[PDB]
Design an enzyme around this catalytic site. Structure first.
Site, PDB file in Angstrom:
ATOM      1  N   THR A   1      83.872  -4.914  48.506  1.00 60.15           N
ATOM      2  CA  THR A   1      84.031  -5.621  49.779  1.00 60.15           C
ATOM      3  C   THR A   1      85.146  -6.646  49.708  1.00 60.15           C
ATOM      4  O   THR A   1      85.535  -7.091  48.650  1.00 60.15           O
ATOM      5  CB  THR A   1      82.721  -6.337  50.196  1.00 60.15           C
ATOM      6  OG1 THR A   1      82.376  -7.238  49.155  1.00 60.15           O
ATOM      7  CG2 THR A   1      81.575  -5.314  50.293  1.00 60.15           C
ATOM      8  N   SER A   2      85.679  -6.994  50.870  1.00 61.84           N
ATOM      9  CA  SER A   2      86.760  -7.944  50.935  1.00 61.84           C
ATOM     10  C   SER A   2      86.217  -9.305  50.489  1.00 61.84           C
ATOM     11  O   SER A   2      85.098  -9.684  50.850  1.00 61.84           O
ATOM     12  CB  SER A   2      87.210  -8.014  52.404  1.00 61.84           C
ATOM     13  OG  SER A   2      88.269  -8.917  52.587  1.00 61.84           O
TER      14      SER A   2
ATOM     15  N   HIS B   1      86.625  -9.279  42.028  1.00 64.93           N
ATOM     16  CA  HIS B   1      85.318  -8.793  41.618  1.00 64.93           C
ATOM     17  C   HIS B   1      85.312  -8.598  40.108  1.00 64.93           C
ATOM     18  O   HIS B   1      86.357  -8.411  39.496  1.00 64.93           O
ATOM     19  CB  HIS B   1      85.034  -7.457  42.288  1.00 64.93           C
ATOM     20  CG  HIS B   1      84.835  -7.578  43.763  1.00 64.93           C
ATOM     21  ND1 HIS B   1      83.791  -8.297  44.314  1.00 64.93           N
ATOM     22  CD2 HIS B   1      85.551  -7.085  44.803  1.00 64.93           C
ATOM     23  CE1 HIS B   1      83.852  -8.201  45.640  1.00 64.93           C
ATOM     24  NE2 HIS B   1      84.919  -7.488  45.960  1.00 64.93           N
ATOM     25  N   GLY B   2      84.122  -8.619  39.505  1.00 62.95           N
ATOM     26  CA  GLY B   2      84.072  -8.402  38.043  1.00 62.95           C
ATOM     27  C   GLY B   2      82.684  -7.946  37.597  1.00 62.95           C
ATOM     28  O   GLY B   2      81.751  -7.946  38.397  1.00 62.95           O
TER      29      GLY B   2
ATOM     30  N   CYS C   1      82.337 -12.038  39.006  1.00 56.99           N
ATOM     31  CA  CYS C   1      80.990 -11.894  38.438  1.00 56.99           C
ATOM     32  C   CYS C   1      81.053 -11.370  37.039  1.00 56.99           C
ATOM     33  O   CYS C   1      82.027 -10.762  36.616  1.00 56.99           O
ATOM     34  CB  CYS C   1      80.161 -10.903  39.232  1.00 56.99           C
ATOM     35  SG  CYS C   1      79.722 -11.495  40.889  1.00 56.99           S
TER      36      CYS C   1
HETATM   37  C1  LIG Z   1      80.198  -9.993  42.028  1.00 59.78           C
HETATM   38  C2  LIG Z   1      81.617 -10.479  42.034  1.00 59.78           C
HETATM   39  O1  LIG Z   1      82.395 -10.113  41.161  1.00 59.78           O
HETATM   40  C3  LIG Z   1      82.163 -11.341  43.152  1.00 59.78           C
HETATM   41  C4  LIG Z   1      83.017 -12.509  42.621  1.00 59.78           C
HETATM   42  C5  LIG Z   1      83.817 -13.064  43.632  1.00 59.78           C
HETATM   43  O2  LIG Z   1      84.080 -12.405  44.680  1.00 59.78           O
HETATM   44  O3  LIG Z   1      84.314 -14.215  43.513  1.00 59.78           O
HETATM   45  N1  LIG Z   1      81.098 -11.930  43.936  1.00 59.78           N
HETATM   46  C6  LIG Z   1      80.858 -11.464  45.172  1.00 59.78           C
HETATM   47  O4  LIG Z   1      81.327 -10.411  45.567  1.00 59.78           O
HETATM   48  C7  LIG Z   1      80.043 -12.264  46.146  1.00 59.78           C
HETATM   49  C8  LIG Z   1      79.962 -11.777  47.456  1.00 59.78           C
HETATM   50  C9  LIG Z   1      79.246 -12.526  48.396  1.00 59.78           C
HETATM   51  C10 LIG Z   1      78.581 -13.703  48.041  1.00 59.78           C
HETATM   52  C11 LIG Z   1      77.787 -14.452  49.097  1.00 59.78           C
HETATM   53  N2  LIG Z   1      78.751 -14.974  50.027  1.00 59.78           N
HETATM   54  S1  LIG Z   1      78.076 -15.521  51.501  1.00 59.78           S
HETATM   55  O5  LIG Z   1      77.336 -14.416  52.113  1.00 59.78           O
HETATM   56  O6  LIG Z   1      79.170 -16.089  52.262  1.00 59.78           O
HETATM   57  C12 LIG Z   1      76.992 -16.808  51.132  1.00 59.78           C
HETATM   58  C13 LIG Z   1      75.651 -16.763  51.514  1.00 59.78           C
HETATM   59  C14 LIG Z   1      74.775 -17.812  51.225  1.00 59.78           C
HETATM   60  C15 LIG Z   1      75.230 -18.930  50.563  1.00 59.78           C
HETATM   61  O7  LIG Z   1      74.517 -19.941  50.305  1.00 59.78           O
HETATM   62  C16 LIG Z   1      76.624 -18.953  50.175  1.00 59.78           C
HETATM   63  C17 LIG Z   1      77.097 -20.142  49.458  1.00 59.78           C
HETATM   64  O8  LIG Z   1      78.270 -20.163  49.101  1.00 59.78           O
HETATM   65  O9  LIG Z   1      76.303 -21.063  49.259  1.00 59.78           O
HETATM   66  C18 LIG Z   1      77.494 -17.915  50.457  1.00 59.78           C
HETATM   67  C19 LIG Z   1      78.658 -14.200  46.721  1.00 59.78           C
HETATM   68  C20 LIG Z   1      79.387 -13.458  45.795  1.00 59.78           C
END
Ligand SMILES: *CC(=O)[C@H](CC(=O)O)NC(=O)c1ccc(CNS(=O)(=O)c2ccc(O)c(C(=O)O)c2)cc1
Ligand SMILES: *CC(=O)[C@H](CC(=O)O)NC(=O)c1ccc(CNS(=O)(=O)c2ccc(O)c(C(=O)O)c2)cc1
Lengths: 240, 240
Positions: free
Chosen positions: A29-30, A88-89, A130
């Site tokens: 995802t973006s 992503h990671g 991640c």
């Molecule tokens: C898994 C990975 O590699 C990546 C690393 C990166 O992109 O930096 N992590 C994610 O893809 C990822 C995607 C989405 C979210 C949640 N983002 S959100 O939906 O805007 C959100 C919901 C609730 C909440 O409390 C927050 C917050 O920042 O507090 C954000 C996280 C990681």
């Protein structure tokens, strides 16, 4: 002495690889909010006198080629080298726009025997990605050969956004918890604190001030601790 | 604050697991020199006022049972917790005398949610063991939920003898390069330097002063860099 020489004519390069949009084939995802981090880092490191180069949406092949080319530059006049990866990671892996590449492949170009003009100089890799999918639910509170050689893995520091095996949080409006925190603590403390002490403040900031909020109970009230990995051999101050 | 409270009535436990002899099925050689390490650590930590407990030749089941039991003690009056593992290993693995056990299984008992009397206190794991088989040839020179909670992985520090994927050297007479260097730097600097800075001196000492000599070219002229992994949230001083 006990600290790296940081008074070379240049502080060094700061390469920021900002991967926001991924090929459809990968299903990734973006990464909304990553532009905020990239801009924050650019300004932060500009203020520390690093020659910042921003690169956007690189394939894994382009990442590797970029790192190879950078490692073949002459860094004789530079004090240090910084590379920031925003993508992503998974454990040990960062994603190009088209798929995964092992972090070791990127870092090996900078080994002490492979990039001679950085031998003895700190090489910093800052990783917002991640390291797996786990969520932290938190808890409520005599043969003398001295210096004939150095190890090829000496003088690397990795500032990972998160613990081994764990998810890493980012929000569209403010960017990632880690980069937000890292930039803040560098802005506040780079002219006064040794780098491991700055990163320790970053750990505390991420650990204490952030907690997820979600209508999805499986994604709610989660926490994160960043993870410093130092193979450095001296103290590092961004000032002299 | 900025540093851990280290003035509880007790500094805490220092558990030393010293595995020297291994079962036939492991194919592991006797770790000559490990008793020099064990004794050096016992004295070093005694001088820092830790309650040292030495354990010798434990199976992996005994290690896991020992850690479970220690984590169930009441550590309320203790400032910190130290565990030293001396054994054969691979990445992410330490050997009991009878076979491998994942380090995560040992450390998990101490998570912030599982050992409540250590929540918020530094948990240090010092690991002398290989992390693979590579040899380093070297190079010639809006919403305020601020505590609240902390991550369950916060407040751990791993002091690994060597870099990820690499061998770890031990001398049959003086003990291992890392433990010899760690004890020397604690002896010299525990009353003067913050712990990451002491470990940085350990990194430099191991990196600069040691180089292997062997009739077998495969093992000759090799180098080692230790690897500090900090998920700590404050500075740690062994004096108050
Ligand atoms: C898994 C990975 O590699 C990546 C690393 C990166 O992109 O930096 N992590 C994610 O893809 C990822 C995607 C989405 C979210 C949640 N983002 S959100 O939906 O805007 C959100 C919901 C609730 C909440 O409390 C927050 C917050 O920042 O507090 C954000 C996280 C990681
Ligand atoms: C692979 C692993 O987990 C363990 C870790 C550990 O036991 O601490 N490493 C080894 O099993 C291991 C075995 C033997 C040696 C070399 N020891 S030696 O033969 O006394 C020796 C030869 C040459 C040389 O230069 C030295 C030295 O100290 O400089 C020692 C190393 C690791």
């Amino acid at each position: 002495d006990n600290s790296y020489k940081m008074d070379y004519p240049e502080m060094g390069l700061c390469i920021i690889i900002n991967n926001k949009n991924f090929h459809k084939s990968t299903g990734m995802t973006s990464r909304s909010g990553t532009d905020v981090d990239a801009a924050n880092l650019r300004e932060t490191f500009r203020n520390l006198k690093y020659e910042v180069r921003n690169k956007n949406d690189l394939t894994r092949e382009e990442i590797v080629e970029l790192m190879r080319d950078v490692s073949k530059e002459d860094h004789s006049k530079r004090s240090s080298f910084v590379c920031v990866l925003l993508s992503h990671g998974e454990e040990g892996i960062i994603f190009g726009t088209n798929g995964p590449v092992d972090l070791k492949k990127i870092t090996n170009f900078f080994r002490g025997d492979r990039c001679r003009s950085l031998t003895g100089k700190p090489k910093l890799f800052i990783i917002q990605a991640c390291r797996g999918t786990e969520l932290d639910c938190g808890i409520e509170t005599d043969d003398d050969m001295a210096c004939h050689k150095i190890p090829v893995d000496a003088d690397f520091l990795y500032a990972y956004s998160t613990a081994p095996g764990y998810y890493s949080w980012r929000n569209s409006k403010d960017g990632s918890w880690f980069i937000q925190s890292l930039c803040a603590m560098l802005k506040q403390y780079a002219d006064k604190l040794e780098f491991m002490h700055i990163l320790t403040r970053v750990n505390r900031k991420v650990a204490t001030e952030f907690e997820s909020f979600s209508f999805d109970a499986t994604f709610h009230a989660k926490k994160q601790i960043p993870c410093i990995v130092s193979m450095l051999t001296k103290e590092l101050y961004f000032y002299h």
